[PDB]
Each structure stands twice: as structure tokens, then as C-alpha cells.
Design a protein around this nucleic acid. Structure first.
Lengths: 121, 65, 459, 23, 8, 181
RNA sequence: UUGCCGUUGCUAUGGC
């Protein structure tokens, strides 16, 4: 019913906010909306995370359109402040993307959350 | 710097001494000679140098200790 | 006139002062050595008068003050000499502050009725950028990137500063002159917290490389490295003995180091909203542990980003007591801003009730050594003071100080006066943005300043 | 937005105007 | 319990 | 004649080494993981064979048996600790489903390539054999080291390494000097 | 009280 949908519960945000951090450390993370847009055009994203408190929220809703067109999972986290902190950047982040790499060291838990996010959808 | 630490200290008045295990950390240095240790131990325990014996030193693989 | 006689003279004068002040003499002498016995021996929380505290918020020059450090001289019983570096500094209280503007500033806080007065400062900049680009050549006299933390040597002879520039310079307290530069020797070992061993020269530094660095300030030489944290080490605290306690941030694990034995104790919270809600039949999952202050040699407290203040005992891995949402819930976003739709009801639907709401973070958490009281800080706009139970099994809210407005980066407490009657002054560095980064939305009324509050004891 | 408003459009332009003066 | 010293 | 001190072989020759698909498979495994010769492959296969044979024997036992429960739980615990077996597949049937490739990525060489410290498998082995890599406190020069989860989280360049913050190498300092002179 | 700019007392809080 809300434009923000689906919204992960408090537990799931923790595992989602987990994966993004190692992705940032492993250079497997793209931060910010326009980067997230680009990755969808190249089709190099497992899934993309968004903040539900984005000011305004309509700005990031174009990302859902791309994924469901491209059959990519997506999810919303309650706080952009928290999401940016996990991303490792000193500024709030409204949208982030995990890049495709079957050769990631953090492959296993990405597919783990990629399973839960799909169930959420 | 070089740091010297003593552990498992057992007073042995029967032999009239104190026995213990020496752990020396020496970053950026090959190792420490026995005389240098005996010096440090002598000031640490407030005893004469001649009353200090040190032996059986093995540096860990990779160095530094 | 041998030194033993001098000690005898100083000891004799010391006893005469105690006799003039006053069974009682025997008790005070025991208290003079209570610190060696690592137990809480300072029960004065009930005697504190929060309501009559004289609050003041002295501002400062630089933007985004990151840390403050206070130096209090203490008389040494073993030699009967004050910790003051020089005769001029006898009974002079000093506070040192740094910001993200690469400037270290010292202030004089001897007078509680009066307020901190600037004495000297040193400012860094692009002049100090290293040309070599190899780490070990990071021996430049000044800062060239943000400053995060400060520690003042208990001898009052040195103050040490660190930040995101992967280095540690120690400055002379009197002139703020850099005497030595200690590179961290890691590409990503950026200093995050500095804690000194009380009444001692050992410094413990927590860095962004997941490691703790132990230094000897007099020898100006590195001693040992501590590995074992699985994420950045945000905070570190110490007391007279070498049990430094640290927090691993997103690893969500508080960790105590026995340096002499080369052994460590692991502490984890492990709280889940599901069980908490069922036992109730808004609780937020703890995200990271950002602050730690060790109340006692066998006890310590931590602050989480879910607004949870947790008490710990070395015997038990799990927290013994928890205070959920200590600083409250962040104000909800405005409906006129959440959505661009004209219809208000459409905008209200985007607020999603209370799901979006999140708690304040515990930006600061400080406990007075071996005492029954500790202070917490956030950007809620008020400093909360708590008292631990006599059994050290739970704590309660003693009061609040609403003078501070902005993020409470870091807190200190200083006391003055006679043993029975002691006046307590709380110094808290206040900024407009969080120390580690600029994530926080600009808080209305937030100001970059040092908050000061003098509290009196009566009863 | 099914029924877009101009409240955000106003402030965004004001943000641009501040940038224009700065440069 | 032992003792600790540092030099050079 | 002192009672003999126990020793064991860590590998066994395959039943038919020359079968074509087997040669192609070992080629693939070695190139993916940069193995020096087939002997590592045989060692890993022998270890997997022992482990999964134990798993099969335990499965043959009826459920709720003290032996099945005890040794099965021990094997599952060891396998998850080494990182081979995922936390959510803690059952003997999944232990039966293991493959040599899994142990192969659990080789330290794979992780040092993998985390971004090295661009390639062979560069990774070069870094390991050259004492540029540290697990926690300890410098490791063995590419075959089997990494635990706590261990893989702590992989880094060693402090003494020129890449870990030490002074430049003999070659670098030599060239810098000759440039100075 | 403050890098700057104000208000409020004779001290306390508003803006970048």
C-alpha cells in the first residue's frame, strides 16, 4: 500500500546492513542512486538496498521499476543514516548496489540475503 | 623498544631463588643477548647482576618475540 | 636532611593536615590506598544535587569538535608531590580540545565558578602533508587531516593527539610544541580512541585497523599490538591497572584485555526483540557498540546505537543489566516533507505509523573512576546522569542536564575541594555533527561548544 | 507522484540559486 | 605476579 | 628397537589415473586454484574420502544411537568450523554432499587471492611463499593452510612486510640509492 | 559564553 514496500523488519536490516559493509570493504559496493541506476543498465547487480526515510521518497522509486523489469531483488531499510554508516561513507546514503561477482569472497551470505529478500518480495 | 616480562614466578627458598619464564618482545630487532637481559632483570628484581641467570631462549617463528 | 627524613617530614605534615581536617584518620588512610584494591569505593551519587547544577555551554572556535581531555593534578601518597608538571601549574586544571579543523586547543578550568579560558593552540593544515607517500615517513610535525581524539598524560607533561592521518604526535602541555611523531604503520590504522593508564605513562590507542596499540610515552616507543577485533575499534577505556576494555562497533562485542597474561575476555550482548516482545506479552536490534567506560576493575558499561546502555561484569559474558532506549526515540519525520503529494493523508501513509522511528545513539558514555555514578550523552539535548545500585546489579536515572544542545562527542568530570565536600564539574565536548562522520541530520539548536556544569554535594 | 505538487520544486530551485551565487 | 620493564 | 612413532600418508593414488575426464578435471582444479602438481589434489581427495566414508558409516547406523549422535555431531562441528559446511546444512546428508572444490577454496591461497590482497591465484601463492601475509599474529608461508572463519576474518599483510608498513625492499632501496648517487 | 552574527541580563539562549 505504501510506496515504501517491502520494508525489512528490524532483524533483516541487520543482515542486509551486514552484507553491505563487507561489500564496501571488498570494493563490491556502489553507493548512491545514480550509481545504482547505472549498475542496473549494465545488469551487474545482485540486488539494491534503499532507505525508506529518503527525503522525499519519490526520488528513489525509479530504482524499483528497473529491477522488476530486470528481475532483480530489492528491499528498503528504515534509515538512510544507518545505511550510509554501513556503506562506510561519512554522508547519508539513500540507495546502494551490490555488484555482480561470482568471484566474491562474500558470495555465500550475499546469496543468503538474496534468498531472504526474494522471500520478502 | 624492548619489553621484558616475567611470568609463572615461583619463590624457591629451598634453593634460595626465584624461578620464572621470561618473555621478551623486541620489534625491529634481531634478539637480546643474555648479558643485556641479566642487566634488565637485575634492576627489575633489585638484585645483583651476578645473582641473575637466564637460559633456554627461543625466538618465535617470524621474529619479534 | 636525607630524603628519608624529607619523606618523614612530608608524611608528618600530611598527617597533621588530616588531624586538622578531623578512627577518621585511620579510615582516610585506608581510602588513600582504596584505588589499589580494584573495587568501587566512591559512593556519592545520592549526595549529588543535579537540580541545582550550574549549567553553562561555553562555545569554541572550530567546527565539529571531536574530543576533549581534562587533566587534574593528584597528590601522590608515595612521594607527597602533586602531579603538576611545574610549580606554576600547582593546582591548575587543564582541558584540551580538538576538532575536524585540525586544531588542538588547551583551556584552564581551575576555577569552577568561572569558565574555561583559552591559553594556547596549534593548528595543522596542508603544509604538513607528507611528500614521501611511504607510511614510515609519516613523521610530519603537524596534522594534515581531521583530528579525532586526545589524551593528557597523568604527569601533566604531555598531551597526545590522533585522527584519520594514521599517526600519533605527543605535544608539550605548556607550549603545545610537538616533540615526537609516532606513525601507526598501517595503511588503514587510523586512531579512533586514546586511553591512558591512570597514574601511569602507558597509552592505549584504538585504531580503524581493528588493532589496539600500546605505547610508553616517556620512552616514546611502541610496545605491543593487539589483534582480535573483527571490526573497527571505536572506543577504549582504562584505569590504574592494565585491563583496558574495548568495543568492536559492528562486531557487537565488548572485549577486555589482560595485557600481562596475553589473555582476553569476550563479551557479547545477544539480545533479540522477538524474545523481548514475547516476555512483554518498540525494541530495536542493537546495531553497533560505540562507547565504553569501565566503572570498576571488574565492571564496565557500554552504549549501543539502539539506545541501549548495558552493564557488564567480568564474571558473566552476558550483560547483567540493560537500559533500553535510554535517550528516547528520534522525532518522527515531518509529513509535509515525507512525500510530495498534496493530500495530507497520502503523506501520513508514508510515515508508516511508528515503523520508521529509530532511537537516539549513545554518542558519549563516561563513568567517574571507582564511583557509583556515570554520565551518558547523545544529541537528544540533555545529559543523563545514572547511579549504579549498591550491589552493582542495576542502575537508575539520577537526573538530567538540558543545557547541552548538539551531539555530545565526549564527556569528562573534574572535582575540587576537600575530601568530605567535593564540587563536581562536568565537561562535555558538543558538536553539530558526529565525530566519525557527517551522517546525522543537522539538529536544531546544535552548536559546536564545550558544555560545562558544576554540581554540588550536600546531605 | 499521482498528484505532484510544487513545494519541492521551489526549494530545489532555491538550492540551485544558492549554488549560482557561490560560483 | 611478575614485573615489566622497557628500554631503548 | 624403540616402539615405532606413528606416521601416515596424506594421499593415495587414484584408482585409474589416466581416464580422460579425470585428467581434464584435475587440469581444471589446478588452474582454478593454482595447484603445483596433482599431489595436492590427491591429498584433498583422500581427506574427503575419509570424511565422507565416516559420514556414510554413521548414516548406516540407526538414528538416535549414542555413537551416531556423538561422532556425527563432532564431524559436523569440525566441518562447520573449517568453513566447508554451512551453518544451515548441519546434517550428515549434506556432509555426504561435499566436493573437493570446497576444501580447495578453504585453502589460504584462495582467500589471499580472493579478498583483494592479490589480483590472481598465482600472485597469491607468490605472496604467501614470500612471507608477505599474516594470520592474526602469525606470518604464514604455507599455501595449503586451511583457514577458519575467525581466521579468514583476520587475513592481512604482515607488519614486517614492505606492503604492510615496513621499509622498502632491498631492490627498492638499492634503486633509490643509485638514483640518489 | 562565543570562528562569526544576534538576543537577553548585569547572566541565559537564537542563526551559518
Amino acid at each position: 500500500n505504501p510506496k515504501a514496500f517491502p520494508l525489512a523488519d528490524a532483524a533483516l536490516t541487520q543482515q542486509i546492513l551486514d552484507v553491505v559493509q563487507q561489500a564496501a570493504n571488498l570494493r563490491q559496493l556502489k553507493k548512491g542512486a545514480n550509481e545504482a541506476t547505472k549498475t542496473l543498465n549494465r545488469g551487474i547487480s545482485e540486488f539494491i538496498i534503499m532507505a525508506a526515510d529518503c527525503e522525499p521518497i519519490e526520488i528513489l522509486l525509479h530504482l524499483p521499476l528497473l529491477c522488476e523489469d530486470k528481475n532483480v531483488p530489492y528491499v528498503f531499510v528504515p534509515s538512510r543514516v544507518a545505511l550510509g554508516r554501513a556503506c562506510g561513507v561519512s554522508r547519508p546514503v539513500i540507495a546502494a548496489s551490490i555488484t555482480t561477482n561470482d568471484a566474491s569472497a562474500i558470495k555465500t551470505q550475499i546469496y543468503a540475503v538474496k534468498d531472504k529478500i526474494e522471500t520478502l518480495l | 623498544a624492548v619489553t621484558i616480562r616475567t611470568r609463572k614466578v615461583i619463590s624457591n627458598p629451598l634453593l634460595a631463588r626465584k624461578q620464572f619464564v621470561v618473555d621478551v618482545l623486541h620489534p625491529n630487532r634481531a634478539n637480546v643477548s643474555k648479558d643485556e637481559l641479566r642487566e634488565k632483570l637485575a634492576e627489575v628484581y633489585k638484585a645483583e647482576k651476578d645473582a641473575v641467570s637466564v637460559f633456554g631462549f627461543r625466538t618465535q617463528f617470524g621474529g619479534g618475540k | 636532611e636525607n630524603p628519608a627524613d624529607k619523606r618523614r617530614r612530608l608524611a608528618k605534615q600530611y598527617l597533621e593536615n588530616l588531624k586538622s581536617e578531623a578512627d577518621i584518620i585511620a579510615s582516610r588512610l585506608k581510602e588513600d590506598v582504596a584505588e589499589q584494591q580494584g573495587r568501587v569505593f566512591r559512593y556519592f551519587g545520592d549526595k549529588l544535587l543535579i537540580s541545582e547544577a550550574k549549567q553553562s555551554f561555553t562555545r569554541v572556535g572550530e567546527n565539529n569538535l571531536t574530543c576533549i581531555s581534562c587533566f587534574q593534578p593528584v597528590l601522590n601518597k608515595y612521594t607527597f608531590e602533586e602531579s603538576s608538571n611545574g610549580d606554576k601549574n600547582k593546582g591548575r586544571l587543564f582541558a584540551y580540545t580538538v576538532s575536524k579543523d585540525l586544531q588542538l586547543t588547551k583551556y584552564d578550568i581551575t576555577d569552577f565558578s568561572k569558565r574555561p579560558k583559552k591559553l594556547k593552540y596549534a593548528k595543522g593544515g596542508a603544509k604538513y602533508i607528507p611528500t614521501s607517500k611511504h607510511e614510515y615517513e609519516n613523521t610530519t610535525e603537524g596534522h594534515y587531516d581531521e583530528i579525532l581524539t586526545v589524551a593528557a598524560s597523568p604527569d601533566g607533561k604531555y598531551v597526545v593527539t590522533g585522527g584519520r592521518d594514521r599517526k600519533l604526535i605527543v605535544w608539550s602541555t605548556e607550549s603545545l610544541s610537538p616533540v615526537k611523531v609516532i606513525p601507526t604503520k598501517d595503511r588503514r590504522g587510523e586512531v579512533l580512541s586514546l586511553a591512558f593508564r591512570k597514574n601511569s605513562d602507558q597509552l592505549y590507542a584504538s585504531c580503524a585497523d581493528f588493532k589496539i596499540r600500546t605505547y610508553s610515552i616517556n620512552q616514546f616507543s611502541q610496545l605491543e599490538i593487539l589483534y582480535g577485533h573483527h571490526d573497527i575499534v571505536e572506543d577504549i577505556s582504562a584505569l590504574a591497572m592494565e585491563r583496558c576494555v574495548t568495543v568492536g562497533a559492528r562486531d557487537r562485542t565488548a572485549m577486555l584485555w589482560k595485557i600481562p597474561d596475553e589473555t582476553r575476555l569476550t563479551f557479547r550482548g545477544g539480545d533479540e526483540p522477538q524474545k523481548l516482545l514475547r516476555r512483554w506479552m518498540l525494541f530495536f536490534c542493537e546495531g553497533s557498540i560505540d562507547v565504553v567506560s569501565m566503572v570498576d576493575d571488574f565492571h564496565f558499561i557500554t552504549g549501543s546505537d539502539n539506545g541501549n546502555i548495558c552493564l557488564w561484569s567480568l564474571a558473566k559474558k552476558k550483560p547483567i543489566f540493560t537500559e533500553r532506549i535510554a535517550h528516547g526515540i528520534l522525532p518522527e519525520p515531518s509529513f509535509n516533507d515525507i512525500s510530495g503529494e498534496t493530500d495530507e493523508e497520502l503523506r501520513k501513509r508514508q510515515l508508516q505509523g511508528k515503523k520508521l522511528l529509530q532511537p537516539f545513539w549513545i554518542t558519549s558514555l563516561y563513568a567517574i573512576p571507582y564511583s557509583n555514578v556515570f554520565i551518558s550523552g547523545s544529541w537528544s539535548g540533555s545529559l543523563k546522569v545514572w547511579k549504579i545500585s549498591d550491589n552493582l546489579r542495576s542502575f537508575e536515572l539520577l537526573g538530567e542536564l538540558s543545557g547541552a544542545k548538539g551531539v555530545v562527542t565526549k564527556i569528562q568530570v573534574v572535582e575540587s575541594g576537600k575530601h568530605g565536600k567535593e564540587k563536581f564539574r562536568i565537561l562535555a565536548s558538543i558538536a553539530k555533527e558526529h565525530r566519525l562522520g557527517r551522517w546525522i541530520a543537522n539538529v536544531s539548536g546544535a552548536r559546536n561548544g564545550i558544555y560545562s556544569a558544576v554540581i554540588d554535594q550536600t546531605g | 507522484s499521482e498528484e505532484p505538487s510544487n513545494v519541492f520544486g521551489s526549494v530545489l530551485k532555491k538550492q540551485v540559486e544558492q549554488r549560482l551565487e557561490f560560483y | 605476579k611478575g614485573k615489566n620493564l622497557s628500554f631503548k | 628397537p624403540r616402539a615405532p612413532r606413528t606416521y601416515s600418508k596424506t594421499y593415495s593414488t587414484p584408482k585409474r589415473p589416466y581416464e580422460s575426464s579425470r585428467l581434464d578435471a584435475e587440469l581444471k582444479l589446478a588452474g582454478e586454484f593454482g595447484l603445483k602438481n596433482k599431489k595436492e589434489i590427491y591429498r584433498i581427495s583422500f581427506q574427503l574420502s575419509k570424511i565422507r566414508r565416516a559420514a556414510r558409516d554413521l548414516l548406516t547406523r540407526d538414528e538416535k544411537d549414542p555413537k551416531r549422535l556423538f561422532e556425527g555431531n563432532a564431524l559436523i562441528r569440525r566441518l562447520v568450523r573449517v568453513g566447508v559446511l554451512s551453518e544451515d546444512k548441519k546434517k550428515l546428508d549434506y556432509v555426504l554432499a561435499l566436493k573437493v572444490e570446497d576444501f580447495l577454496e578453504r585453502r589460504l591461497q584462495t582467500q589471499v587471492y580472493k579478498l583483494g590482497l592479490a589480483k590472481s591465484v598465482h600472485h597469491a601463492r607468490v605472496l604467501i611463499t614470500q612471507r608477505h601475509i599474516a594470520v592474526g599474529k602469525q606470518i604464514v608461508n604455507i599455501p595449503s593452510f586451511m583457514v577458519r572463519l575467525d581466521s579468514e576474518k583476520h587475513i592481512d599483510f604482515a607488519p614486517t612486510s614492505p606492503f604492510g608498513g615496513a621499509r622498502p625492499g632491498r631492490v627498492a632501496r638499492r634503486n633509490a640509492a643509485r638514483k640518489a648517487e
